[PDB]
Design a protein around this ligand. Structure first.
Ligand SMILES: [Zn+2]
Ligand SMILES: [Zn+2]
Ligand SMILES: [Zn+2]
Lengths: 111, 111
């Protein structure tokens, strides 16, 4: 239950997560999972809860993240921390990429 | 042992990791730590081992990563997975940013 050492964008498949949202599962094992998520402008990251701890990084674009109801617009270079079981989501104000990281792995992304 | 919800680049301090390497510890708890690491051209990520699982994402620039001796040049959009206790390092071929994620947290980055 792990990935290859080197995960190259041109060698990994993009998965359509939803309308305007694509993703590439990158390096992971059972305890850590790094996911690249490409958002189009207006794409909505539906609000969800999960026991997995999550730390996200904004590579590019502009997002309105909401965590536990607290809202804040975030942009490239910013990060967001989502403690276990918190309700969280996002709305892409400007097309860009998010790196979503998880502990433990999100087994539903693989299976 | 956790960070604020929203970690903004302009509100977080940059730490000089080494010659040509700066970093911002972003969202983390005890089980997951996301670190932004800004490399200058020629900067060297010294080879190290640690039981922590690590998944890295190349935001920008060009790097020669080495993992368990296997070498591969990586660029924006690529990822690298480093299993516990593997020897790994990097050399920045073009100035850019790496997102280093860890499970469990790297307590030596905080303390
Ligand atoms: Zn764990
Ligand atoms: Zn989530
Ligand atoms: Zn490392």
């Amino acid at each position: 239950t792990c990935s290859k050492v080197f995960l190259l964008e041109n060698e990994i498949s993009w998965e359509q997560v939803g309308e305007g949202i694509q993703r590439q599962i990158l390096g992971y094992d059972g305890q850590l999972m790094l996911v690249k998520v490409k958002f189009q402008k207006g794409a909505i990251g539906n609000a969800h809860e999960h026991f997995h701890s999550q730390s996200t990084y904004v590579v590019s674009g502009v997002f309105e993240f909401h965590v536990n109801g607290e809202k804040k617009i975030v942009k490239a270079g910013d990060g967001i921390y989502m403690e276990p079981d918190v309700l969280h989501g996002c709305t892409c104000l400007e097309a860009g990429i998010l790196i979503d990281t998880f502990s433990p792995m999100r087994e539903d992304f693989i299976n």
